[PDB]
Symmetry: C2
Subunit: 487 residues, 2 copies
């Protein structure tokens, strides 16, 4: 129960009373557990290196007292594990009683060990202590793999999940590898990383409810950024012709399996590129990234959890491209002619939503009626592969340059994995005359377009969602170290 | 004035009605401007690679007097420059009149050029167009090479700064070089980059007023992080023995030349490492970083502004160590007995602050008294070198492990450059029983129960360190204000 904790705290006070520091300041270790394994894994069975005295540290993860002269424990560090073989025969008896100094060690204790390496006669690579010191006690009962199988403990006490579940450390290692590969991918291509503000006086770049904070000495209400689109574009005007940023953005919407209020975004902007270059970049990056982590272009994904059969997702280029409005017309046998904000085709879209009894949008604007229609008729079309939804209308793309041969549409692209959007990119609207919302968006951004924004392609990445599909997770809370929870 | 912008706006429309598109979708370029300079810099004076046709782009920054058969321009891109030599005999007349094409070009316009590389017989590398297309026009008149010193322009319109002032691009490139160097420094030594929340229900890890904001659908009031200290330490408990984060933190206080309400910090945590390990890391990193940027350990810095003689800052290790209480005692010729919140020690700390004509802190705490005495008597001791103020009292360091031989003090260190703090680090307090806030004074203090609970699972002996990335950028780019190293500093409209 909880009496374990109170007894362990009383033990700490008992050691403080006896003149023992249960939290020593420094322990100088000679080697780490992974280095220990690679250095000695090819020892012979039963072999000892009793002349090699090492200092090792780790966390005791299992205790077993066979008889009363041999003590076995599991010592873990950095995700790897070795055994510790405390033999009374090799104990330094001037520095303490053998039995009393090993009876105190509990599961979860951080310890420092002075001893030699070797292998048990069965062949288990072990550390052989002459002396073991408590470094930091685990006062609570450390749970085993049961208990952390599916609770909020993994999300509220992530440290427990990292210690107990081998899967999760590999998961967050993979997330760091993904961001690393992306940063180098762009840097190798001449892109320049920058920091744009997170607090601004308007929130543009996309359209979602923002966070409201107040600056005290400026006496001003500021908005957490919903995207990095606008200031990055101004840098393109500033002559930084290949610029990008990886960081958190904040959208005050609803929490679900693919939405966290703060999430990690990557937006790059690429002068003198168009959406044809953006599609090529998307295909190159995702295929090269998937191969970099798996040595193959095909991966497995448990789309409906580990209790259902998984599907295979081939990342070999090229990916299919599906024009949104044309595909809605093919699936519905409807012809939604322009304008799209017509009451005539707002009526037609509503009747399709009514016929199939799809969710009706909050404000039934054409931009969101088109959204809901694609969400129900295109977005889950391809599951064996990633695919693009391209050539969005202009009333859905206020910042995307108009299509050069298709009136009313933009040169936009979104890439979907298993029906989840992980990418948004388009040829950038750069004619200040045509951004008719300049006379929400900033006036600072509009006047910068008046100084000359070159032809530009821009692309945004949802890093958390890509991590999910590459770590085989169904919820975005499994790829964020401390997801935001309700207390 | 607005007449110039209105003229360009009508010109743009006039081209659209004549059939030309002043904003074409895509122009496929063959080579960049730096690549152009690198590939053709060493040609003879007068060379003409007429058969080698290329597609180059850039921004027109100088329009020379029309010679009626030759037109000269300055083309810039990526902070480098080449000359545009439009010759009438090389013009492709199948696509428009020569004079009418180039008369439209204004300074600031972004153009696409089909031409061949060559050198003027004076030594100037040039591009020789046969066709120039407007890619996107500059509708305002740009300032000139030395007419952008009103810096509420440079801060509010950073794109104009980056175009006109050569030093501005160099300053922000150096900032990225700094952060890249820091990331690879930590990654080379086994450290692991992570991301912690920017929004929490408590704001701990420092002593500062926080930004508060509301999550609408969740109906909760959250606090922006003032530091990454607490969740990173919880990751050490999780067994990530070398962990760090480079990102923004938010502190709702006053703005000056060294304070911006949002600023970039980097905190790392290092299991089984202590104060002594952190001292050498600081010396290794700063000395290696400065040498990496400059090829030397000494730099020049205008601590009194660009109008005054600068000083030399030597980053040659080792740097001096000054223990704050001992030095306050030596400079003021007084001895401050313990405890420090003693009423006689408070009294004599107050009498010193008033014998030396010093501002009295708003809450006359024992810690804030030791704060002000430090800044007036120590923090400007050395100006030619970085140096450490060390061994802070525990009443100023609520998360630093108690000094192992000096009761009342911690194993804490702060590094100062020219009086400004850039580094903060200490041996981590890992005894949950000694964290007095897990079972303070009734404004900018303190704790988190999730953090206290994680401590009860065993935080190993750890050293952690925090770097103020922006202030370090200031000293290495010779800037006096933090606004010179932030691309878009937060400002008042
Ligand atoms: C930057 C963008 C480019 C396209 C791909 C991806 C979006 O689909 C984003 C939308 C979104 C909203 C939200 O409120 C909370 C979220 O976690 C997400 C998300 O993870 O993904 O990132
Ligand atoms: C992470 C810390 C530890 C190392 C030194 C440095 C602090 O001195 C920080 C204090 C601070 C407060 C503030 O409200 C606004 C600011 O821009 C800064 C700042 O730049 O530096 O970074
Ligand atoms: N701001 C976009 C990403 C960039 C799209 C291209 N400008 C988004 O939030 O989806
Ligand atoms: N988080 C602290 C730095 C402590 C360094 C070790 N955690 C700060 O903002 O000053």
């Amino acid at each position: 129960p909880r009496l374990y904790f109170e007894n362990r705290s009383k033990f700490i006070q008992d050691q403080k009373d006896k003149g023992i520091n249960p939290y020593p300041h420094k322990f100088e270790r000679t080697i780490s557990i992974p280095e220990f394994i690679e250095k000695y894994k090819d020892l012979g069975n039963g072999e000892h290196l009793e002349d090699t005295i090492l200092n090792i540290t780790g966390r005791i993860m299992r205790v077993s007292a066979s008889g009363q002269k041999l003590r076995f424990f599991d010592l873990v560090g950095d995700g790897e594990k070795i055994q510790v073989l405390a033999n009374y025969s090799f104990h330094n008896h001037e520095k303490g009683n053998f039995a009393e100094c090993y009876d105190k060690i509990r599961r979860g204790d951080i310890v420092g060990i002075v001893g030699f390496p070797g292998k048990s006669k069965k062949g288990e690579l072990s550390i052989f202590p002459k002396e073991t010191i408590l470094l930091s006690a685990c006062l609570h009962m450390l749970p085993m793999k049961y208990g952390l199988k599916d609770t909020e403990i993994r999300y509220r006490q992530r440290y427990l999940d990292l210690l107990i579940n081998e899967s999760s450390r590999h998961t967050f290692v993979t997330r760091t590898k993904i961001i690393n590969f992306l940063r180098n991918f762009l840097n190798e291509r001449g892109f320049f990383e920058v920091e744009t503000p997170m607090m601004n006086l308007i929130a543009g770049g996309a359209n979602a409810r923002p966070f409201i904070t107040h600056h005290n000495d400026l006496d001003l209400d500021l908005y957490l950024r919903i995207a990095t689109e606008l200031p990055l574009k101004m840098l393109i005007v500033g002559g930084i012709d290949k610029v990008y940023e990886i960081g958190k953005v904040f959208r005050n919407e609803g929490i679900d399996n693919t939405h966290n209020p703060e999430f990690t975004s990557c937006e790059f902007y690429w002068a003198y590129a168009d959406y044809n270059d953006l599609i090529k970049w998307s295909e190159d990056f995702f295929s090269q990234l998937v191969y970099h982590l798996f040595g193959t272009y095909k991966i497995s994904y448990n789309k409906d959890g580990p209790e259902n059969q998984p599907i295979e997702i081939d990342f070999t280029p090229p990916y299919p491209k599906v024009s949104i409005v044309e595909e809605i017309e093919k699936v519905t046998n409807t012809i939604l002619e322009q304008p799209f904000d017509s009451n005539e085709t707002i009526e037609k879209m509503i009747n399709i939503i009514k016929e199939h009894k799809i969710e009706l949008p909050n404000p039934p604007t054409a931009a969101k009626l088109l959204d809901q229609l694609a969400s129900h008729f295109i977005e889950n079309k391809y599951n064996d592969k990633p695919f693009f939804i391209v050539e969005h209308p202009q009333i859905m793309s206020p910042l995307a340059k108009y299509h050069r041969t298709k009136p009313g549409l933009t040169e936009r692209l979104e890439m979907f994995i298993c029906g989840k959007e992980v990418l948004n990119a388009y040829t950038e609207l750069n004619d200040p005359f045509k951004q008719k919302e300049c006379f929400q968006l900033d006036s600072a951004f509009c006047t910068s377009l008046e100084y000359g924004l070159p032809p530009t392609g821009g692309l945004g990445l949802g890093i958390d969602r890509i991590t999910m599909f590459l770590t085989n997770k169904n919820s975005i809370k499994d790829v964020i170290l401390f997801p935001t929870m309700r207390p």
